[PDB]
Write an enzyme that holds these catalytic residues in place. Structure first.
Site, short mmCIF file in Angstrom:
data_model
loop_
_atom_site.label_atom_id
_atom_site.label_comp_id
_atom_site.label_asym_id
_atom_site.label_seq_id
_atom_site.Cartn_x
_atom_site.Cartn_y
_atom_site.Cartn_z
N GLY A 58 33.88 13.77 33.20
CA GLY A 58 34.30 12.39 33.05
C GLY A 58 35.80 12.20 32.98
O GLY A 58 36.56 13.10 33.33
N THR A 100 38.57 10.15 30.30
CA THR A 100 39.07 9.30 29.22
C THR A 100 37.99 8.41 28.59
O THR A 100 38.31 7.40 27.97
CB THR A 100 40.22 8.41 29.71
OG1 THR A 100 39.73 7.48 30.69
CG2 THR A 100 41.33 9.26 30.32
N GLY A 101 36.73 8.78 28.75
CA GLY A 101 35.66 7.99 28.16
C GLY A 101 35.08 6.98 29.12
O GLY A 101 35.71 5.97 29.44
N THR A 138 27.65 10.15 28.57
CA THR A 138 26.41 10.37 27.83
C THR A 138 25.33 9.38 28.26
O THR A 138 24.14 9.72 28.27
CB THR A 138 26.66 10.26 26.33
OG1 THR A 138 27.13 8.94 26.01
CG2 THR A 138 27.70 11.28 25.89
N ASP A 193 45.04 60.38 32.86
CA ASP A 193 45.01 60.97 34.19
C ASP A 193 45.28 62.47 34.20
O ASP A 193 45.32 63.08 35.28
CB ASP A 193 45.99 60.25 35.11
CG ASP A 193 45.52 60.21 36.55
OD1 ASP A 193 44.53 60.90 36.87
OD2 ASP A 193 46.13 59.48 37.36
N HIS A 216 45.37 68.53 39.19
CA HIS A 216 45.92 67.90 40.38
C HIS A 216 47.19 67.12 40.06
O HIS A 216 48.00 66.84 40.95
CB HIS A 216 44.88 66.99 41.03
CG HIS A 216 43.68 67.72 41.55
ND1 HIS A 216 43.71 68.47 42.70
CD2 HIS A 216 42.42 67.81 41.08
CE1 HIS A 216 42.51 68.99 42.92
NE2 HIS A 216 41.71 68.61 41.94
N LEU A 227 52.65 69.25 37.79
CA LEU A 227 53.49 69.86 38.81
C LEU A 227 54.32 70.98 38.20
O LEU A 227 54.85 70.85 37.09
CB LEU A 227 54.43 68.81 39.42
CG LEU A 227 53.77 67.47 39.75
CD1 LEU A 227 54.81 66.48 40.23
CD2 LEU A 227 52.68 67.67 40.79
C1 A1N Z 1 53.54 74.06 47.84
C2 A1N Z 1 54.18 72.76 48.15
C3 A1N Z 1 53.59 71.68 47.31
N1 A1N Z 1 54.54 70.73 46.84
C4 A1N Z 1 53.99 69.71 46.04
C5 A1N Z 1 54.77 68.78 45.59
C6 A1N Z 1 54.21 67.82 44.83
C7 A1N Z 1 55.09 66.74 44.31
N2 A1N Z 1 56.21 66.97 44.32
N3 A1N Z 1 56.71 65.88 43.83
C8 A1N Z 1 55.71 64.95 43.51
C9 A1N Z 1 55.68 63.73 43.00
C10 A1N Z 1 54.52 63.16 42.86
C11 A1N Z 1 53.39 63.78 43.20
O1 A1N Z 1 52.19 63.08 43.00
C12 A1N Z 1 50.99 63.69 43.12
C13 A1N Z 1 50.53 64.60 42.01
C14 A1N Z 1 50.10 62.57 43.53
C15 A1N Z 1 50.25 63.76 44.42
C16 A1N Z 1 53.46 65.01 43.71
C17 A1N Z 1 54.58 65.62 43.88
N4 A1N Z 1 52.88 67.88 44.57
C18 A1N Z 1 52.21 68.89 45.10
N5 A1N Z 1 52.78 69.76 45.81
C19 A1N Z 1 55.94 70.79 47.14
C20 A1N Z 1 56.13 71.74 48.26
C21 A1N Z 1 57.56 72.07 48.55
O2 A1N Z 1 55.49 72.87 47.99
N1 GDP Z 2 28.69 -2.03 30.95
C1 GDP Z 2 28.39 -0.72 31.03
N2 GDP Z 2 28.89 0.13 30.10
C2 GDP Z 2 28.61 1.45 30.14
C3 GDP Z 2 27.75 1.96 31.22
N3 GDP Z 2 27.64 3.28 31.03
C4 GDP Z 2 28.36 3.60 29.93
N4 GDP Z 2 28.94 2.52 29.39
C5 GDP Z 2 29.80 2.52 28.18
O1 GDP Z 2 30.25 3.86 27.93
C6 GDP Z 2 30.07 4.21 26.55
C7 GDP Z 2 29.47 5.60 26.45
O2 GDP Z 2 30.47 6.59 26.67
P1 GDP Z 2 30.06 8.14 26.76
O3 GDP Z 2 29.12 8.35 27.92
O4 GDP Z 2 29.41 8.58 25.47
O5 GDP Z 2 31.47 8.88 26.97
P2 GDP Z 2 31.75 10.08 28.01
O6 GDP Z 2 30.51 10.49 28.80
O7 GDP Z 2 32.29 11.26 27.24
O8 GDP Z 2 32.81 9.63 28.98
C8 GDP Z 2 29.15 3.17 25.94
O9 GDP Z 2 29.74 2.64 24.75
C9 GDP Z 2 28.99 2.07 26.97
O10 GDP Z 2 29.51 0.84 26.46
C10 GDP Z 2 27.25 0.97 32.20
O11 GDP Z 2 26.51 1.33 33.14
N5 GDP Z 2 27.60 -0.31 32.04
#
Ligand code: A1N
Ligand code: GDP
Lengths: 121, 1485
Positions: free
Chosen positions: B538, B540-541, B545, B1091, B1095, B1098
């Site tokens: 709705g 602002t009223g 309902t 992690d 693996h 290093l």
């Molecule tokens: C043997 C060979 C293997 N080597 C590496 C290097 C690395 C390595 N370096 N720096 C890194 C930075 C990040 C990294 O993130 C991983 C663990 C996600 C792969 C790895 C390396 N990781 C395995 N092996 C380097 C060469 C020369 O030698």
């Molecule tokens: N004249 C008229 N008034 C309505 C009608 N439906 C709802 N109203 C007015 O709306 C009011 C009800 O608001 P409500 O449904 O409870 O509020 P809301 O649903 O939170 O926005 C009542 O006091 C009614 O006077 C309609 O069909 N005709």
């Protein structure tokens, strides 16, 4: 002290110098070093009586634990010093270090059967 | 200060002891500024006296500033300063090595700088500098530290471009006083593989006949001369070496084949892949060498074929002629051993009948991209045949007749009818690709049981008619490529039987388990679908309902059965206008309202409603309806003239209903229109859906009544609690998707909104400076949690919100007939992220104007030009580079929103003209025309002398947001899309190689792509510099390509599959470390990868201890590299674990797609993985084998971060440990011997007794038994509990006081607390050491002693080790182990010692700590923590050299462990390499 961390009375007790430890007592009774060793621990390790009972009477900890968790009773049982063992015993047996062995176990590995009987009863 | 004194020492160099008083120097900076280093050097080198030397060194100690002291000292070549200063610290800093190399010097100095640490780039630069100067010594040692691999027994030489090679260069490559000064000042203070890849060797005639290394290289066995510039290879060298069997010399410039190289002793894998041999390559006869296996004679001028093989070679397995100039018909080819041959990219018309009917074992014949029409009788032994991209009219009968065909790909062929399987006669078909072909019938009902093993069938880009359900008899199918057919539009329900398929390529033709499960459900039960959407509209009223009553807030969803259609009474109040496009579904038919009482004004005023309908649902018929006929009917004139199908949606009917009488016609027309819908010719008012969907809909409708009225939103488990139907986990998503498409419930994510009336009445109830509001929730308790997310994302309140030199700014227009329904209230919501600090932005209902500074602003407004009926937006932005970046980003957001929400608009007038304004001194210009004018970089009008650069006016088109450094020059690049210049495939495109201001710089060419995805890829790839990232050089727009760097040695997959023996224990870890570092940087950049796989990784150099080894390639999933739930964020780590698993495996998970493709995906659903060591037999490797298990956790919240895994990988313990063997529980062992033997009982292991020797035994009673209290043994020596001896009883030298240690390196030993040596030689007392450390340690039993230059003494239960001089026979000192321990439960009690020849001592503490030490410098290397709880025995074993460690895991568990002998060297290497990598990463930016 020193760079490693130890007090002269520790050296005196370990070396068994009665006059020096007595005159120094007249410092800390329970001074612990970087090893955690106590003067009582060193006295038990050396097994030299009068410093042991003097330190015990002076307030040394009965159950002080070093870095290795060894009591002076543990060292006395380990090194065959039964006399130190009973001297500490009437000063107040189930304490465990980090490894968790009682002085009974230390006597068992070292074969100190004489200390072994004393510890069980 | 005072130059007179330095002038005095200038004379005092040769003067008498008067210089000693100069004492006064140390009594009181800038002392070394003038010449102090040289004077002190004449002093300590003046025949060195110790009394003066001590004071001179004490004065010099004030110098230790330190670097500049070396810099002044390094100016003059002098080994004493070199060694002393390197021992003191201070070499690769400034550089220095380059200038020392440039200056005349001696080998010792450069060796010192090399072995003390030097950056690889600086060493390479110095080497290149020194190449020109005649030399044979300095460069020789430079190579030693630069490119030598003793571990692999090989010498690589790659990227470092050497001018030429000579024999004297590789001499040593093929197999003191300063320390005393430094220590006292501190106290005061056969080759296998040779690589010659990138070295531009014009000739190799240097080391050819006889030289120093000619005999040495005679058994090289592997030589590489690839990527070189060789020509006419000398036959003398091939006679010189008689063991080479891996020579690969490719990319060289050859003229004719040598034919004498094959006269080598035993040569295999001869590769010449780019040599330009002449037209004839006929090998010389009378040479029968049966050794060649692979012969890559590729990419040549060979018009004919090498018709020499049959006579000469007997085992030419991989005879390859790929990409040659082969033109004529080949010879009968009488070879009897050819296994794999390729003839791709040749010029072949046909083959003779006897051409291939000679080899009995040809199994891989393939000829890609050839003019082939007939295929003459391939032998039955063939299994794989690749004959794609050929002039085939029908499949030759010979192919139908071979018994054992496996994979056939006949893509890029023009054939009509493919034979049925009743003619194939082969039951082992695996892959069949037939893309780029004209196939209309797929007859298989004849005999389908024959086809059972087919896995990947490809039929993309084919004019098929229909899919017979007989192909459902196929079982092993995995990938059906049926996309681009554009003629099927159907799917037989039998496809559901194919559960093994995990991919389906449906693109432009109308995934994985979802579609197949849906087809299974439909096959099990299919019922017609009767439910349609009727959205009344709705303004602002008006009679909205009222019309529904005969047949407002929110949308007021109602159900209206008749099929059944639900009426959505949308809102009239403009305030509600923002969310409406959310419900304008594609499959529906809209009404409208006129309110004819307003006459001509209202029908035109309501036009934007039809505009929005056209924008959202273009293929939706509309029924225009008047609603005020009670109270001027000329509106039909404009309705028929301007309102028809010209530009507005496909109007199908218009009526003049009163409010009765015409309602019958209204209803009849509505039924007729709804029944005859035919969306893309589908009649979707009567489509077929499984009965499960209908049952679920009935369940939801029933549960609507039985639900909480206030909050009818049910939970995720509430759907489960409803089910008694049969729907699995995967059925629910697609089911709720279909139901939402049918307008029953809403679900976007753990809650399902039933009764859409409540949701659309409450979510829009919020609608009923100005426009801004904070949290003011009222009416209706824990709702806000999802309520805020739902409201903010869907509808601050954007709605109802407050309704210059002409050359330094850039303006753009995007004129549209009207502004779409919910346009601004989403555009302003999207433009709250853009940036190069929060900017200031006074955005009104139709503008943003967000700015940071006068140099950074962007103004998107609502332009209303004079005499312009339609409204449009004007966007202004300053012409700076940052402004261009902002413009690119915002225009990308604009076109993304348009393509993602209003596809009808940007559908080819096009109702969307993107104007770009310009002014030479404003003039309209179409953006499409501007893109078409990409042939040049300057645009000029008909008048030629004035022009404008393209980037100045369209910065989004030509790359200007990216740095200007990324700008390719066409004259330099040579990117040709050749099928071999590529390097690999990946993502949205591929990558190649080309010359670009460099050697072989790679080029990523893009596949269908766009400058919208290119923009995103470029922006993510750039502004990211990292050593582990594959940085790009330039970008171009002509192919629209990228430029990247090279993996010199290939990719990781190729490495694994080809050379599995080149992966060292230090290479795998280095690759893993660098990939982890790259992933860490990616995560720190908040970018996912998803992690990772072989693996994608290093490799650059195969040198283990390099600075750059592995990098990660392109990054915006995989059957064998799948994420836990995303592919079947933290998901990257799980992918990383899979990468680690295969690298540890070395090719097990890969090379598992040929015998069971899906097995790499069908067993890792949730934490199920085989044990790698037992499964694959690879070498054991703990502490990373546990790392993968602990990282790839099933719960993503439990997996460690990428930074954490990188840190754990950065540890030499992970690299040096090789075994960790456990022992049975509650079992204790106190001794082992050099298999491994342990300790009344005895234990044995393969990879109360006191101690054992090798076979000797002995218990606490000291039993002297003869087998094949004893306290120590050796190998024959025996020690007792009170100091005895035995030389067995040959002799018993009593010394006691128990003997407990005996060692050899004249043996040494220990007894009680006294050391002996030998016939007792020297019984040195050791208890007299109470002045240092406790007396108890000195007065204790001595446990172990090791013999070296000094003597190291360890006593039982001691935290300190002693050192005694061997010659001086005095206490050299103490090393306190606890001090090292305190720096880092700790025990510190020494139990065992071990000595290494590199002056490294390993000390075992009582606790689980192993201290490493260096005897040379007396410094700790490290502490091996986390290991165990106890350490008992350590001893070197030659397995590999390794020393074991024993301990208890105290509950008692004894454990054994093996550490590598190179632990401290590895620690130093890793620590240096990590620092170098970090410095490189810092320097990259
Ligand atoms: C043997 C060979 C293997 N080597 C590496 C290097 C690395 C390595 N370096 N720096 C890194 C930075 C990040 C990294 O993130 C991983 C663990 C996600 C792969 C790895 C390396 N990781 C395995 N092996 C380097 C060469 C020369 O030698
Ligand atoms: N004249 C008229 N008034 C309505 C009608 N439906 C709802 N109203 C007015 O709306 C009011 C009800 O608001 P409500 O449904 O409870 O509020 P809301 O649903 O939170 O926005 C009542 O006091 C009614 O006077 C309609 O069909 N005709």
């Amino acid at each position: 002290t020193d760079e490693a961390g130890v007090t002269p009375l520790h050296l005196a007790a370990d070396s068994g110098h009665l006059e020096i430890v007595e005159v120094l007592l007249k410092a800390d009774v329970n001074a612990w070093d970087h090893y955690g060793f106590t003067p009582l621990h060193l006295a038990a390790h050396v097994g030299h009586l009068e410093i042991v009972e003097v330190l015990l009477k002076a307030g040394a900890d009965v159950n002080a634990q070093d870095h290795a968790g060894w009591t002076p009773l543990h060292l006395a049982a380990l090194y065959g010093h039964l006399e130190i063992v009973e001297v500490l015993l009437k000063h107040g047996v189930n304490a465990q270090d980090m490894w968790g062995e009682t002085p009974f176990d230390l006597a068992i590995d070292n074969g100190n059967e004489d200390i072994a009987e004393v510890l069980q009863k | 200060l005072a130059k007179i004194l330095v002038s005095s020492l200038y004379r005092f160099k040769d003067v008498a002891e008067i210089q000693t008083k100069g004492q006064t120097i140390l009594a009181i900076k800038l002392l070394v500024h003038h010449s102090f280093d040289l004077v002190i050097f004449h002093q300590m080198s003046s025949n060195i006296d110790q009394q003066f030397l001590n004071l001179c060194c004490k004065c010099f100690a004030k110098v230790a500033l330190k670097n500049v002291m070396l810099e002044r000292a390094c100016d003059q070549n002098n080994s004493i300063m070199v060694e002393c200063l390197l021992l003191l610290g201070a070499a690769n800093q400034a550089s220095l090595i380059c200038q020392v190399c440039e200056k005349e010097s001696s080998p010792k100095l450069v060796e010192l700088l090399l072995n003390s640490g030097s950056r690889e780039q600086d060493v390479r630069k110095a080497l290149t500098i020194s190449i020109g100067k005649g030399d044979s010594q300095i460069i020789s040692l430079l190579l030693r530290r630069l490119a030598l691999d003793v571990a692999n027994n090989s010498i690589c030489l790659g990227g470092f471009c050497i001018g030429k090679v000579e024999p004297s260069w590789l001499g040593p490559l093929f197999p003191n006083i300063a320390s005393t000064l430094a220590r006292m000042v501190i106290r005061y203070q056969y080759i296998t593989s040779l690589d010659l890849s990138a070295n531009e060797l014009r000739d190799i005639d240097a080391l050819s006949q006889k030289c120093c290394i000619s005999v040495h290289l005679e058994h090289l066995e592997k030589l590489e001369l690839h990527q070189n510039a060789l020509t006419s290879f000398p036959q003398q060298l091939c006679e010189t070496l008689k063991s080479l069997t891996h020579l690969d010399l490719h990319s060289n410039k050859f003229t004719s084949f040598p034919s004498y190289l094959l006269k080598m002793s035993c040569i295999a894998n001869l590769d010449v892949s780019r040599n330009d041999i002449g037209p004839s390559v006929v090998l010389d006869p009378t040479v029968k060498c049966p050794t060649l296996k692979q012969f890559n004679l590729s990419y040549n001028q060979l018009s004919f074929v090498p018709e020499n093989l049959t006579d000469v070679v007997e085992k030419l397995e991989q005879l390859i002629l790929e990409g040659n100039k082969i033109s004529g018909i080949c010879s009968p080819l009488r070879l009897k051993e050819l296994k794999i041959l390729n003839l791709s990219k040749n010029h072949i018309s046909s083959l003779s009948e006897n051409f291939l009917e000679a080899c009995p074992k040809v199994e891989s014949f393939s000829a890609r991209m050839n003019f082939l029409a007939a295929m003459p009788f391939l032998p039955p032994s063939m299994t794989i045949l690749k004959l794609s991209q050929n002039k085939f009219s029908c499949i030759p009968e010979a192919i139908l007749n071979l018994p054992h065909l496996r994979s056939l790909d006949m893509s890029s062929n023009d054939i009509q009818y493919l034979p049925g399987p009743a003619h194939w006669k082969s039951l082992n078909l695996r892959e069949l690709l037939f893309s780029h072909n004209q196939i209309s019938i797929l007859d298989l009902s004849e005999k389908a049981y024959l086809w059972s093993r087919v896995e990947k069938l490809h039929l993309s880009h084919n004019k098929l008619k229909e899919i017979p359900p007989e192909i459902g008899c196929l079982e092993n199918l995995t990938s059906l490529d049926v996309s681009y057919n554009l003629e099927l539009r159907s799917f037989p329900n039998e496809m559901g039987k194919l559960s093994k398929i995990w991919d389906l390529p449906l693109d432009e033709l109308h995934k994985a388990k979802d579609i197949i499960r849906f087809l299974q459900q439909r096959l099990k039960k299919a019922v017609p679908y009767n439910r349609m959407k009727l959205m009344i509209v709705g303004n602002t009223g008006s009679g909205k309902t009222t019309l529904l009553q005969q047949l407002t807030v929110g949308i007021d969803v109602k159900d209206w059965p008749i099929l059944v259609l639900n009426v959505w009474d949308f809102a009239g109040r403009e305030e509600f206008y923002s969310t409406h496009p959310h419900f304008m579904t594609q499959r529906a038919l809209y009404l409208a309202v006129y309110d004819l009482s307003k006459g001509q004004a209202e029908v035109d005023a309501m036009k934007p409603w039809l505009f929005n309908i056209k924008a959202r649902a273009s293929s939706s018929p509309v029924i225009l309806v008047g609603t005020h006929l009670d109270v001027k009917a000329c509106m039909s004139k404009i309705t028929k003239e301007l309102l028809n199908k010209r530009g507005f949606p496909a109007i199908r009917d218009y009526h003049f209903v009163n409010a009765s009488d015409a309602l019958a016609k209204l209803r009849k027309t509505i039924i007729n229109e709804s029944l005859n819908f035919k969306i893309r010719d589908q009649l979707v008012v009567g489509q077929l859906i499984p009965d499960c969907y209908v049952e679920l809909e009935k369940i939801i409708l029933s549960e609507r009544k039985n639900v909480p009225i206030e909050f009818p939103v049910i939970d995720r488990k509430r759907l489960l609690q409803l089910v008694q139907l049969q729907l699995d986990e995967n059925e629910l998503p697609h089911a709720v998707h279909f139901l939402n498409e049918s307008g029953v419930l809403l679900h976007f994510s753990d809650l399902y909104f039933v009764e859409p009336k409540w949701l659309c009445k409450i979510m829009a109830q919020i609608l009923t400076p100005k426009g801004i509001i904070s949290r003011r929730d009222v009416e209706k308790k824990n709702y806000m949690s999802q309520y805020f997310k739902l409201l903010e994302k869907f509808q601050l309140v954007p709605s109802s919100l407050s309704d210059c030199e002409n050359s330094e700014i850039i303006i753009r227009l995007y004129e549209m007939p009207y502004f779409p329904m919910g346009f601004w209230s989403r555009l302003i919501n999207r433009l709250l992220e853009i940036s190069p600090l929060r900017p200031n932005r006074m955005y009104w209902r139709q503008g943003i104007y967000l700015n940071w500074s006068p140099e950074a602003y962007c103004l998107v407004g609502s332009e209303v030009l004079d005499n312009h009926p339609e409204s449009f937006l004007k966007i202004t932005v300053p012409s700076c580079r940052k402004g261009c970046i902002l413009l690119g980003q915002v225009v990308d957001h604009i076109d993304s929103l348009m393509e993602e929400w209003f596809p009808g608009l940007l559908e080819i007038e096009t109702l969307l003209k993107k104007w770009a304004l310009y002014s030479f001194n404003k003039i309209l210009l179409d953006d499409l025309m501007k893109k078409a004018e990409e042939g040049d970089l300057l645009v000029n009008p008909d008048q030629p002398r004035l022009t404008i650069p393209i980037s100045q006016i369209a910065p989004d088109l030509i790359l200007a947001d990216l740095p200007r450094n990324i700008m390719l020059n066409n004259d330099e690049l040579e990117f040709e899309q050749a099928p071999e210049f590529l390097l690999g495939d990946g993502s949205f495109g591929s990558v190649y190689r080309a010359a670009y201001e460099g050697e072989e710089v790679a080029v990523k060419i893009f596949n269908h792509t766009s400058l919208r995805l290119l923009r995103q890829e470029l922006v993510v790839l750039c502004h990211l510099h990292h050593p582990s990232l594959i940085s790009l050089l330039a970008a171009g727009i002509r192919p629209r390509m990228l430029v990247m760097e090279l993996a010199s040695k290939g990719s990781l997959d190729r490495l694994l599959q080809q050379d599995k023996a080149s992966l060292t224990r230090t290479l795998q870890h280095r690759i893993a470390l660098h990939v982890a570092d790259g992933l860490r940087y990616l995560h720190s950049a908040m970018i996912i990868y998803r992690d990772l796989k072989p693996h994608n990784v290093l490799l650059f150099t195969l040198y283990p201890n390099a600075a750059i080894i592995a990098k990660i390639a392109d990054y915006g999933g995989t059957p064998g590299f799948r994420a836990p739930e995303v592919a079947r964020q933290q998901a990257d780590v799980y992918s990383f674990g899979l990468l680690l698993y295969d690298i540890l495996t070395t090719g097990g998970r890969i090379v598992e797609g040929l015998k069971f493709p899906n097995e790499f995906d069908e067993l890792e659903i949730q934490g199920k993985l085989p044990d790698p060591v037992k499964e694959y037999g690879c070498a054991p490797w703990p502490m990373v084998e546990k790392l993968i298990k602990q990282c790839l956790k099933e719960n993503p919240q439990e997996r460690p971060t990428s930074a954490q895994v990188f840190d754990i990988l950065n540890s030499a313990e992970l690299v040096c440990l090789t075994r960790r063997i456990l022992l049975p529980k509650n079992v204790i062992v106190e001794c082992m011997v050099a298999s491994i033997w342990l300790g009344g009982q005895l234990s044995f292991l393969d990879l109360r007794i006191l101690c054992l020797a090798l076979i000797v035994s002995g218990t606490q009673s000291g039993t002297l038994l003869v087998i094949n209290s004893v306290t120590c043994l050796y190998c024959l020596l025996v020690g007792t509990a009170d100091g005895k001896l035995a030389i067995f009883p040959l002799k018993i030298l009593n010394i006691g006081t128990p003997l407990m240690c005996l060692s050899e390196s004249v043996m040494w030993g220990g007894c009680g607390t006294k050391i002996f040596s030998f016939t007792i030689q020297k019984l040195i007392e050791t208890r007299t050491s109470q002045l240092f450390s406790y007396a108890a340690f000195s007065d204790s039993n001595i446990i172990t002693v090791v013999v070296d230059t000094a003597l190291y003494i360890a006593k039982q239960n001691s935290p300190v080790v002693e050192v005694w001089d061997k010659k001086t026979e005095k206490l050299c000192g103490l090393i306190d182990c606890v001090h090292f321990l305190r720096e880092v439960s700790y025990s510190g009690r020494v139990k065992t010692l071990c000595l290494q020849k590199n002056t490294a001592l390993w000390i075992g503490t009582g606790g689980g700590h192993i201290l490493l030490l260096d005897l040379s410098t007396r410094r700790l290397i490290r502490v091996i923590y986390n290991f165990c709880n106890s350490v008992r025995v350590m001893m070197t074993a030659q397995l590999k050299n390794v020393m074991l460690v024993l301990g208890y895991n105290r509950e008692i568990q004894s454990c054994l462990t093996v550490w590598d002998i190179n632990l401290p060297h590895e620690v130093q290497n890793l620590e240096k390499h990590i620092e170098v990598r970090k410095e490189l990463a810092e320097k990259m930016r």
